[PDB]
Design a protein around this ligand. Structure first.
Ligand SMILES: OC[C@H]1O[C@H](OC[C@H]2O[C@H](OC[C@H]3O[C@H](O)[C@H](O)[C@@H](O)[C@@H]3O)[C@H](O)[C@@H](O)[C@@H]2O)[C@H](O)[C@@H](O)[C@@H]1O
Ligand code: NA
Ligand code: NA
Ligand code: NA
Length: 546
């Protein structure tokens, strides 16, 4: 087998792809595919080589290397997915960074190169900032080169600048985290007045706040995002950030529904209705900078989904704990946006387990990504480590080597097949059955102890996703205690599909098999009944009928 990488996370139209393999195998071939069709083949020779993809924008490809056997069988050696996109917003693959102290350039490069290998196309820099009310440490004319952050940890400006430049070299976007409305207790009371805060009562008595303990320097006080004094103040803060640090945009966070809260004047703050004017103010102030905003458990999503955001973002909490609740967020977000935006989910796996050091439960993580990706979602989960908590610097849980390598196939798969997964089409009811009893099918939402079939019409293709819950001991996506089961492999499983058109080609791809390379399947057809066999199902397989 081989490791197979490209130089960048994504490629603009017209840019050349440069590949690296760790070793060459003889009698081998490189196969370039678009949606399962071979568009180029060439001999596997040099360990470095280049390819200029087709010029078409927003297209995914797979590249697969195979050794050819004398008998005409082929053996997959490795695969890599490629994304040709002029901009990340269509197919976001969001990652994070969380440590910005005295980290060497070489260590920084390793972190970025790893994210690059997962094809991460933008990075949320979390808790880089000086203060929620003043994200730039120092002033534009006199920056602070080192600052202490909200947990009194050192942050080096040179680390921040370095990371941005490294991310840019891989074609990634860099988004700075801040709240929409946060103020820490060292704010300058000459600049943020009492009239701007949100209060827990109608008489401007007790400020609303996010309570923090050690090691945080302050609780987080809350301002009104519709307050134009706050909007102009934070706009200036943002401009100051962008003059010092070459961030591409602002990742806007929030605290979610604050309940019973008031403006200074005793009126209702109704914060979800404040976010739209806030977003438009931030955009107008820095018209060339990107925005994304977290709808914390969908709070604000309806109100903001039509605003100037690159894509939608949902942090998923109770009671949205079932697999079907993930898919409901994705469906709701498409509708809220009038089909203008795809979604990234922040959906923290193994959350209770992550209360102590340990490792992620591989099958939990993979099953959740299979569901998210199959339904055209994306998952913010990778940075220096994988997320177990909303506090991104928490690195309690490690990924096993197996999880790292499996997840690289899943990211390859959702990159290569992005045109099938989140580029139009209609969800449909499957008309497929087992033809040998080796598996038992359900549909969506999923049944425990069955393979779920999900259908989608995309162009002249009919897609079936098989998502395997045969061995599931829960339909809760979070796998909070790390108990979800590894699914047993199902092999050479016959399926009978009803299909009312003439079938030309059926092909299979799975991140669990052959690196997600497309496998054309033999089929027969008798009336509307189409019979074929899939090689392997473990977590997720995709069947495409053309
Ligand atoms: O030991 C307690 C707790 O410690 C970690 O979590 C810390 C802390 O994380 C979140 O709060 C910090 C976060 O607040 C706002 O969002 C700011 O805007 C951010 O800058 C800032 O990072 C969380 O909301 C808190 O409740 C939590 O205390 C661990 O990760 C926890 O598991 C652990 O219980
Ligand atoms: Na691969
Ligand atoms: Na880091
Ligand atoms: Na938040």
């Amino acid at each position: 087998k081989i490791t197979l990488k490209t130089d960048k996370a994504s490629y603009k139209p017209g840019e050349t792809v440069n590949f690296t393999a760790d070793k060459v195998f003889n009698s081998s071939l490189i196969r370039y595919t678009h949606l399962g069709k071979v568009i180029k083949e060439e001999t596997f020779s040099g360990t470095s080589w280049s390819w200029l993809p087709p010029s078409d924008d927003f297209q995914g490809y797979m590249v697969a290397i195979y050794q050819t056997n004398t008998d005409g069988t082929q053996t997959i050696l490795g695969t890599v997915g490629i994304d040709v996109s002029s901009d990340w917003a269509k197919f976001p693959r969001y990652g994070f960074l969380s440590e910005f102290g005295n980290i060497s350039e070489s260590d920084r490069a390793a972190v970025i190169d790893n994210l690059k290998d997962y094809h991460i196309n933008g990075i949320q820099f979390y808790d880089w900032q000086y203060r929620q009310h003043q994200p730039l440490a120092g002033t534009v004319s006199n920056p602070m080169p080192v600052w202490n952050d909200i947990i009194n940890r050192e942050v080096y400006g040179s680390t921040v600048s370095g990371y941005i430049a490294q991310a840019h070299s891989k074609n990634m976007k860099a988004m700075f985290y801040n709240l929409a409305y946060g103020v820490l207790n060292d704010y300058d009371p000459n600049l943020i007045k009492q009239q701007q805060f949100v209060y827990k009562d109608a008489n401007h008595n007790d400020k609303d706040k996010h309570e923090l303990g050690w090691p945080f320097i302050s609780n987080i006080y809350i301002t009104d995002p519709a307050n134009t004094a706050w909007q102009n103040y934070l706009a200036q803060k943002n401009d100051d950030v962008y003059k010092v640090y070459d961030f591409d945009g602002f990742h806007i966070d929030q605290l979610g529904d604050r309940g019973n809260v008031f403006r200074y004047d005793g009126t209702n703050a109704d914060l979800k209705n404040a976010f739209p004017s806030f977003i438009s103010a931030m955009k107008s102030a820095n018209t060339n900078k990107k925005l994304v905003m977290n709808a914390v458990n969908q709070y604000g999503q309806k109100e903001i989904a039509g605003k100037e955001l690159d894509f939608l973002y949902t942090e998923v909490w109770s009671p949205n704990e079932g697999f079907k609740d993930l898919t409901q967020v994705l469906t709701d977000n498409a509708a809220y946006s009038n089909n203008s935006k795809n979604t990234v989910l922040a959906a923290y796996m193994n959350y209770n387990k992550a209360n102590n050091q340990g490792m992620f439960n591989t099958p939990g993580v993979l099953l959740t990504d299979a569901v998210i990706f199959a339904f055209g979602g994306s998952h913010l989960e990778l940075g220096e480590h994988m997320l177990g908590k909303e506090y991104f610097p928490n690195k309690n849980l490690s990924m096993s080597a197996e999880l790292k390598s499996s997840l690289l196939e899943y990211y390859d798969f959702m990159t290569a097949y992005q045109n099938l997964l989140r580029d139009g089409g209609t969800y449909t009811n499957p008309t497929i059955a087992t033809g040998d009893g080796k598996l038992n099918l359900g549909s969506w939402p999923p049944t425990m102890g069955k393979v779920a079939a999900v259908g989608k019409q995309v162009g002249s293709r009919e897609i079936i996703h098989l998502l395997n819950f045969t061995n599931a001991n829960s339909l809760n996506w979070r796998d909070t205690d790390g108990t979800q089961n590894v699914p047993d492999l199902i092999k050479q499983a016959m399926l009978n599909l009803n299909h009312s058109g003439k079938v030309t080609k059926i092909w299979y791809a799975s991140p669990d098999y052959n690196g997600g390379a497309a496998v054309e399947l033999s089929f027969s057809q008798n009336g509307e009944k189409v019979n074929f066999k899939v090689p392997v199902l473990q977590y997720w397989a995709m069947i495409v009928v053309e």
